Amino acid sequence: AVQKVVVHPLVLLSVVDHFNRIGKVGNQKRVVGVLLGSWQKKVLDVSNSFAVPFDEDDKDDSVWFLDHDYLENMYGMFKKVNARERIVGWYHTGPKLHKNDIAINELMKRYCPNSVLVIIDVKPKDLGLPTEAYISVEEVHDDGTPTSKTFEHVTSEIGAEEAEEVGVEHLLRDIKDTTVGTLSQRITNQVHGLKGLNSKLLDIRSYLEKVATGKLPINHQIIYQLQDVFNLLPDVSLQEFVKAFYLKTNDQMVVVYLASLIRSVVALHNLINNKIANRDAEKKEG
Amino acid sequence: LREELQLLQEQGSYVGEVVRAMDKKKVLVKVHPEGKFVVDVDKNIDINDV
Amino acid sequence: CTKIINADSEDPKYIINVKQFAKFVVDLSDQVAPTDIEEGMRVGVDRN
Amino acid sequence: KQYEKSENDLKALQSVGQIVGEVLKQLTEEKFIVKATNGPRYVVGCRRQL
């Protein structure tokens, strides 16, 4: 039972460099390491990590290597220098995840019972995706269905404590997405807030294209869980009509007479204060 | 605003009382909760400070 | 310099007052012998 | 049982120790005026849910 995980920004950061460490010999396109944590409540916390040697073969995709002995000693080091921290799970990248992750997880659940895994996305870093985290439960699958593993999802976020925002704010220094925004800042939030609306929708576009067209076997769970979405959107009516112009006008009145008039009179005050001070220095030059 | 914010980021000055102190570029200051100090002057002021 | 309240047996665990700063439970440094560190004596004390 | 006592001390070793003070008044919904037992006055806040 996990509410959400809290990503401290040293861990992802300490994944990207380790991807860049092996990148000079880079032929693996995945990096697996150990995720240290600090379990507090139903909300989880992560603030440290390290890596571990791992390999994987494209053929048969089930021959894989977590190193236990390397995981024993180096965690024994980080325990010795800081006894606050313990393991909570592991990480990898390459968002098209290999199906071997059942075997990786079920091994190292003997280190943490409620083990958890976080996928970072080093190269896809563009539209709307910070990270992603899964949780491991196993039902059979459903009522009259065979057995399965079925990774489940817990929502994620990026956390912030003091003396890392100090490291953050000193490192941005360029545009920073400055504090509480202007008119231009809010409109861009509406732009790329909406540019991801169809982006999530173009993904759910392609799913019920390729499942309803007739390629891959249908889930049943996702279908009716999509159905109630379409029977929940609001429509226009007379009660929506007279109400909207009741309070659009009420928002409008504050703009119209109180903001446009008074800003004009202030600029009109700057007329007379300029023109008096202009010509009284003009007529008194000589 | 930059000139203010830099001079804000500065450890403030002490205050010490001198009714009289000796000459030759060094004076004798007891400050507030402490003893006496033989200090040096800055070069924008005089030895005629007494 | 300080004073010594008392001592212990087989191991120093000496009790010493600056008395203007606090009273401390300290050790002797390696340059001395534990004989002449008797009670009520002026001793040389490290700053750190 | 002996390992239980050792792990209690590993918990016990990491505490910080605190400062005793008393509240003089409340200024705003987050600004307080407290005073230490032997020292100065301050302006403080709460943790989350105090």
Binding site: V81, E164, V166, H170, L183, Q190, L197, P234, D251 | - | - | -
Partner: protein
């Protein structure tokens, strides 16, 4: 064959390891190592930092554990990258940055073993707001007492980055050690992933905060803006020749006529437009 105005490159991953580990043990002057590569004569880079277990002595040569040294180095050889140590650091909470008398002895140990072995001093409790009090130093000989200490040469980037501060030149600056400049090996794909992932909001960009507190806040500003308009009436109908360039300067108070004016008009404008414009779009987008 002597020193110059050099340059120290620290990685972004180093700096977060520095001032988190310093903030962790805020009373007790934490200690760690500095792991990089001497790239040429007068630039140096460091890519990685790991900490040290803390002894009862504190920051000295004895807190350097040689068996923790070689074992930590060994398990970084096969994972990540092996490289040479290039220095060390410690934390000075109660004051900004200067090498103490025990700091100067452990610097002698490393500069005898290594090439230059740059030290780093970090104050975590002073480094709070938007600036970091971090500085790096290097021990200078006494053999050049008849010659120029800080042997610098043909460059004009010495007068930048700091004048030697008064709280640091009261200690062994500039006759025991010298300062050295710091800039950051800062790159794309780490800059953008720290920008876009720490401050982001996707579905929040078209929410409403709807109207029970929004239209309430439309009352919350207008009311004192009425009274401040009556105060704006007062100064303008006053308009007396009381030497009016002196009359304007002897009553600066961050007050009525323009300062406490249209600032409110801006906030009333930005709040209501972004509210009503997002309201019309949700009618457009959702059916």
């Amino acid at each position: 064959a002597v020193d110059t105005a050099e340059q120290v490159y620290i990685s972004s991953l180093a700096l977060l390891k520095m001032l988190k580990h310093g903030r962790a043990g805020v009373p007790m002057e934490v200690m760690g190592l500095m792991l990089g590569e001497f790239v040429d004569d007068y630039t140096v880079r460091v890519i990685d930092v790991f900490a040290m277990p803390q002894s009862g002595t504190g920051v000295s040569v004895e807190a350097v554990d040689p068996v923790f040294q070689a074992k930590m180095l060994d398990m970084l050889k096969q994972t990540g990258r092996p490289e040479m140590v290039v220095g060390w650091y410690h934390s000075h909470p109660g004051f900004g940055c200067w090498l103490s008398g025990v700091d100067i002895n452990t610097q002698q140990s490393f500069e005898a073993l290594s090439e230059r072995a740059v030290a780093v001093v970090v104050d975590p409790i002073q480094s709070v707001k938007g600036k970091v009090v971090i500085d790096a130093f290097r021990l200078i000989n006494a053999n050049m007492m008849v010659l120029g200490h800080e042997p610098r040469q043909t460059t004009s980037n010495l007068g930048h980055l700091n004048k030697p501060s008064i709280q640091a030149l009261i200690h062994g600056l500039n006759r025991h050690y010298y300062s050295i400049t710091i800039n950051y090996r800062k790159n794309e794909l780490e800059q953008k992933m720290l920008l876009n992932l720490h401050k982001k909001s996707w579905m929040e960009g078209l929410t409403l905060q709807d109207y029970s507190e929004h239209c309430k806040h439309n009352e919350s500003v207008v009311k004192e803006m009425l009274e401040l308009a009556k105060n704006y009436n007062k100064a303008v109908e006053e308009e007396d020749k009381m030497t009016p360039e002196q009359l304007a300067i002897k009553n600066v108070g961050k007050q009525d006529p323009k300062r406490h004016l249209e600032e409110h008009v801006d906030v009333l404008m930005t709040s209501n437009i972004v509210q009503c414009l997002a309201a019309m779009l949700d009618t457009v987008v959702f059916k």
